[PDB]
Amino acid sequence: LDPGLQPGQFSADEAGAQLFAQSYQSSAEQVLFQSVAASWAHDTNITAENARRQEEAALLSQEFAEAWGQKAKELYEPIWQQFTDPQLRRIIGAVRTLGSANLPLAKRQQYNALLSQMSRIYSTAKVCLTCWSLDPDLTNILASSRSYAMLLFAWEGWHNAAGIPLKPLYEDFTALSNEAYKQDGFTDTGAYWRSWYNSPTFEDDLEHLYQQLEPLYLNLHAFVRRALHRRYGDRYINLRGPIPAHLLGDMWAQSWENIYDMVVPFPDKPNLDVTSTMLQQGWQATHMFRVAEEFFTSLELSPMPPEFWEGSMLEKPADGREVVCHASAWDFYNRKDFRIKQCTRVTMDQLSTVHHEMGHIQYYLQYKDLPVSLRRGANPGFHEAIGDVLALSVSTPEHLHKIGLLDRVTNDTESDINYLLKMALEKIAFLPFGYLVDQWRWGVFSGRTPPSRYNFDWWYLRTKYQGICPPVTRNETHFDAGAKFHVPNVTPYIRYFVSFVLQFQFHEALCKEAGYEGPLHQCDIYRSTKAGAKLRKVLRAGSSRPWQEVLKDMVGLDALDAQPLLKYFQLVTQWLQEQNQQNGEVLGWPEYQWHPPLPDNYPE
Ligand SMILES: *[C@@H]1O[C@H](CO[C@@H]2O[C@@H](C)[C@@H](O)[C@@H](O)[C@@H]2O)[C@@H](O[C@@H]2O[C@H](CO)[C@@H](O[C@@H]3O[C@H](CO)[C@@H](O)[C@H](O)[C@@H]3O)[C@H](O)[C@H]2NC(C)=O)[C@H](O)[C@H]1NC(C)=O
Ligand SMILES: C[C@H](N[C@@H](CCc1ccccc1)C(=O)O)C(=O)N1Cc2ccccc2C[C@H]1C(=O)O
Ligand SMILES: *[C@@H]1O[C@H](CO)[C@@H](O[C@@H]2O[C@H](CO)[C@@H](O)[C@H](O)[C@H]2NC(C)=O)[C@H](O)[C@H]1NC(C)=O
Ligand SMILES: *[C@@H]1O[C@H](CO[C@@H]2O[C@@H](C)[C@@H](O)[C@@H](O)[C@@H]2O)[C@@H](O)[C@H](O)[C@H]1NC(C)=O
Ligand SMILES: [Cl-]
Ligand code: NA
Ligand SMILES: [Zn+2]
Numbered sequence: 187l188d189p190g191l192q193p194g195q196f197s198a199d200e201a202g203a204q205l206f207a208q209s210y211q212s213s214a215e216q217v218l219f220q221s222v223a224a225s226w227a228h229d230t231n232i233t234a235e236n237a238r239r240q241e242e243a244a245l246l247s248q249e250f251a252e253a254w255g256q257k258a259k260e261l262y263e264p265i266w267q268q269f270t271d272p273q274l275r276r277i278i279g280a281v282r283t284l285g286s287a288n289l290p291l292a293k294r295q296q297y298n299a300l301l302s303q304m305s306r307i308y309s310t311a312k313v314c315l316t317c318w319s320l321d322p323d324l325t326n327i328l329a330s331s332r333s334y335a336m337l338l339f340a341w342e343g344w345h346n347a348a349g350i351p352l353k354p355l356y357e358d359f360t361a362l363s364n365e366a367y368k369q370d371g372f373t374d375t376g377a378y379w380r381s382w383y384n385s386p387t388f389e390d391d392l393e394h395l396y397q398q399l400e401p402l403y404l405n406l407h408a409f410v411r412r413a414l415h416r417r418y419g420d421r422y423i424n425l426r427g428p429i430p431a432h433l434l435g436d437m438w439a440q441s442w443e444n445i446y447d448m449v450v451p452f453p454d455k456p457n458l459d460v461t462s463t464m465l466q467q468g469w470q471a472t473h474m475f476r477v478a479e480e481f482f483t484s485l486e487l488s489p490m491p492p493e494f495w496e497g498s499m500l501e502k503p504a505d506g507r508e509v510v511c512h513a514s515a516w517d518f519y520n521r522k523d524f525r526i527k528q529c530t531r532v533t534m535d536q537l538s539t540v541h542h543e544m545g546h547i548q549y550y551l552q553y554k555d556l557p558v559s560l561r562r563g564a565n566p567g568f569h570e571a572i573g574d575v576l577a578l579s580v581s582t583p584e585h586l587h588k589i590g591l592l593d594r595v596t597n598d599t600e601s602d603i604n605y606l607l608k609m610a611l612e613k614i615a616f617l618p619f620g621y622l623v624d625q626w627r628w629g630v631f632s633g634r635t636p637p638s639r640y641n642f643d644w645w646y647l648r649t650k651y652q653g654i655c656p657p658v659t660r661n662e663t664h665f666d667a668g669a670k671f672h673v674p675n676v677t678p679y680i681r682y683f684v685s686f687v688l689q690f691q692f693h694e695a696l697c698k699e700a701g702y703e704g705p706l707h708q709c710d711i712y713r714s715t716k717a718g719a720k721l722r723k724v725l726r727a728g729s730s731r732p733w734q735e736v737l738k739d740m741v742g743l744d745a746l747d748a749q750p751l752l753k754y755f756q757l758v759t760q761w762l763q764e765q766n767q768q769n770g771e772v773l774g775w776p777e778y779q780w781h782p783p784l785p786d787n788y789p790e
Contacts, residue, residue, distance in 0.1 A: 545573020
């Protein structure tokens, strides 16, 4: 560790702790910068040499964390929790958590190499028949093919290609992860991840929210399944069974907006999927980012800096390069560089993704002057919800009209149902998946799910929550969890479930603040500078204050609450119920064992 990056001496008291944190800050920014830069060089240009550089950057970060972590303990262990400066308690709190820096060097190198290889396997996997990548090829097939066999080929090929090779590495990762966080005093890595919400009743709180949301999901499910039956027939759709996992428009069945064309109740109202118009009008990636930016400046939030437009990767490279395509927003921790890396396609759902990612950037811009340790969301759910909140306004027919993507506007009950259904396919359908992923991982971390039940426990949860089944037989050679990015990339998931609740709480608060008086799902906060100021206050706080308090100041409540989401969707909730009753549907999938047959001519 460079002389310049090592900790010196400070008095063992609060005034010295302030001096400590300031000195940490100065060297931390240099260490984070080099680490994020090496990650960037790799992820926008995957090569062995880039990987080796990234691995060395990670080791350097571990060394830093160890020196400053050990020093924070040495000087402040008896007294940090009693400090008068609450920001300073949070900073010391973060600095003394060593994580992977608790590993001896040899396990460090093994841990870093495992992360690097899991990521390289996920992002370079291909399905060959001439090889299809996940982005754009397999995404497009899953989104717009309607051929059972083609969808099955893409689904099965992806799951096999990414998942199977990941399993030995993921087992070794899990062991070392646990070994690391056990030395910081947690039972397993999952306990550590859960501690970020600082809520003794976290798991119970989540389960109480899910119980209120599940009826909506059950009703959406029944309706969609019925629509699928009418297209695919009773051989491949069981009206009392789970839905085959390849038919819902997405590789993970995680959101269903791409099958909107199959379920839309009133098809001679305005077409609410504007992808065509976007293509017809010749939208490019850059237009999508500029349109998102302009929403943000309409609120008197910050524009993207020059360094964002010069630095970002906003399209998949056409040169020789292999890249990580999964969309991400990057803070280089130097108060100056911020970038998005996305293999942007010209679709409506990607317009939302652009907003999601710009939400991350906007947070980075607003809190960049805080101490590095506080440069994060009030909780991880907050960071994931910013961009989605704006995208709720953008997707309203009224707003789409204003930006030239919808000629006709209508304000009638049929158009509303169409709109709310489209939104339920995006939002309601995700809830079970958003909940289940970390249940899987918590079980793996705690040892409840050993390697010998990875796929068994995955599909138990996928069926339990989502009501889907694999369209071909799976066994424990398969590692279907590892065919989802966040798993080999070691990115927590529960944040997305929290996000999907939070974003409706935020939407209701910002619509109220903007003076809007109509139904929640028709609110557009565009150009509301009052809404901007309320949102800006959250962003600027970073993690400096308890998330419960930040939320209370924003929405008038100190807890996650499903009531705003329920109110948003009220009309379609009522309507789907009535439709399912009228059609004689069974809610749920009591034939839980059912799986579809293979096609006759398959794979050939
Ligand atoms: C789409 O249409 C709805 C419904 O509009 C109502 O019924 C229609 C058939 C017409 O007769 C309309 O004239 C009628 O308002 C619109 O929602 C309605 O918005 C208004 C305000 O924009 C709401 O009124 C407010 O009520 C509060 C008290 O509760 C007062 O303090 C305010 O001064 C204001 O009068 C009204 O509650 C609301 N009604 C419903 C059904 O919720 C909706 O705004 C419109 N959509 C768009 C995007 O224009
Ligand atoms: C596109 C996005 N990408 C992550 C990237 C997270 C990441 C963290 C650390 C290193 C690399 C990447 C994000 O920015 O958070 C995403 O992964 N989802 C958002 C999203 C948006 C709408 C609906 C659901 C979700 C969940 C999630 C997903 O698509 O699975
Ligand atoms: C992708 O990364 C490689 C390194 O892994 C880059 O190649 C280096 O480029 C510099 C400047 O042209 C050369 O001096 C080095 O000798 C190259 N190293 C190797 C081992 O090839 C490459 O330029 C990167 N590609 C892009 C488009 O950024
Ligand atoms: C796991 O499965 C592999 C591939 O085939 C799968 O199982 C057979 C029986 C078919 O039903 C097929 O549709 C499935 O996808 C096998 O090659 C493998 O040996 C199986 N068992 C083990 C222990 O890996
Ligand atoms: Cl999280
Ligand atoms: Na999609
Ligand atoms: Zn995100």
